[PDB]
Amino acid sequence: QTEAREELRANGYSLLPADRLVIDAELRQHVKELAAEWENLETDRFRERAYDRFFFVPRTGEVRLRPHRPYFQSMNANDYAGGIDRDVAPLSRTTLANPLLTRLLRADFENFPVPEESWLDDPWDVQCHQFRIISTPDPEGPHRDEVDFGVIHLMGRFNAAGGESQVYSLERELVAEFCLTEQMDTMFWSDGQILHAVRPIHPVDPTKAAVRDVLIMGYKHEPELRREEQ
Amino acid sequence: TEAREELRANGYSLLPADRLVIDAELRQHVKELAAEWENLETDRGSRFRERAYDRFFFVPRTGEVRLRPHRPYFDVAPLSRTTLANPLLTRLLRADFENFPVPEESWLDDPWDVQCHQFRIISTPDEPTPEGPHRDEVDFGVIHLMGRFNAAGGESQVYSLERELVAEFCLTEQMDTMFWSDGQILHAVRPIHPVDPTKAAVRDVLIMGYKHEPELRREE
Ligand SMILES: [K+]
Ligand SMILES: [K+]
């Protein structure tokens, strides 16, 4: 955690490959259960996704699932309430039941350099995205997520090349590029300090699809967010 | 794998372009990259050299690659903007490294310093003593042939640490590649000279040298 905070301070991002301790037996099992959820995402070159937001208090570890704000309400109010301006299904029942989801939400936060101690007692909105990227046999530029801190975990990579992650300065110069390749390979970043992007994926075996599964969480300090019905 | 043990046993391995599988995206980016050699700045008679150069911070486990501040003394120019923007450069950087027989798996978690050189050799009518064997003072090297035009000679040479010639081969096709263990052999390349004596002989080459540097820090 402490090298990570300093890496985020200095460089705006920090990497955590799974190769430093990926699993005891019970953890490994919860990883497998979680990653399997990416096979059951609502289908829409091709991107399948699910989404939810959490009320989160770092001091207590309190995590509450915020009500899934309907798209028709956001659009017609022209107010997406800080969340995404897209229409996405909620996280599955078995995603939410998986204790690894709450564990990762709490544990990832400890890698971020929180600039004011008082923020640990405030609510944070935590946006949680399951993304499956698909390139079938047949790119967004540098950006921010409009949060304070982000984390990405690779759930899976299937017949995929490319997909390199790119870190840019606020001035849109490439300063770093890395590769999440193993399951649970992880990156943390300070979202107001860098911009980022990901290269397209392409199949290694071109007769088959290439698939990249990631879990992205974005943490935004929100001192005025109050508890909602759950 | 084969290149590893070939490097482990003999200190160098060849990878001809034909032994490689090339799709169309790779095909497209190779042409974009090789064309960069047409816009290099001169000075590194009978022999001319145009070049460009930069260094990267590299961690193999994560694939992290960071361009390091351009130091003007390896005045060599930096790699061009379109060179650095070509995804093939860092993809070769990472892929080439996988061929090296790293002695300790833990070195995969350390920083490496990677030098990346764009070399163009131009040769006009001969009136030129070839170089003796030598190191590059790295742990592992790779050379990729980008282009060879109207050129005879230019053979790559592998020597023993005793400075005796053990092997000689010639990179001739685009993306012909040589890997080597730099503390293990010495190497050299012979001069090129024009075939058609009324045109320049040109040999274009991408060289990367990898040096394990556990104490290298990230630079901002
Ligand atoms: K768990
Ligand atoms: K020459």
Residue type, A187: M
Angstrom distance (rounded) from CA A195 to CA B11: 42
Name the CATH architecture for the domain at B2-212: Sandwich (2.60)
Given an 8 Å threshold on Cβ–Cβ distance, is B63 in contact with A178?
Answer: yes
Torsion over CA: A143, A145, A148, A153 (sign): negative
Q: Any idea of the CA torsion for B13, B19, B21, B22, to the nearest 10 degrees? A: 90
Angstrom distance (rounded) from CA B118 to CA B208: 9
Facing residues of B205 across strands?
A: B119, B145
Taking the CA of residue A210 and the nearest CA in chain B, the distance in Å comes to: 15
In Å, how far are A27, A159, A204, A210, B27 from A207, measured between CA atoms?
A: 34, 10, 9, 10, 18
Nearest by Cα to B219 from B73, B64, B61: B64
Superfamily for the A2-221 domain: q2cbj1_9rhob like domain (2.60.120.620)
Q: Is A60 annotated to bind ligand? A: no
Declared resolution, Å: 2.0
Q: Which chain A residue is nearest to residue B56, measuring alpha carbons?
A: A176
Residue A160 Cα to ligand 1 midpoint, Å, equals 27
Facing residues of A2 across strands?
A: none
Q: Indicate which of B21, B59, B64, B97 best probes the interface with A, i.e. most A CBs within 10 Å of its own CB.
A: B64
Technique of determination: X-ray
Given an 8 Å threshold on Cβ–Cβ distance, is B62 in contact with A17?
Answer: yes
Q: Which chain B residue is nearest to residue A17, measuring alpha carbons?
A: B62
Q: For chain B, which residues make up each domain, given as ranges?
A: 2-212
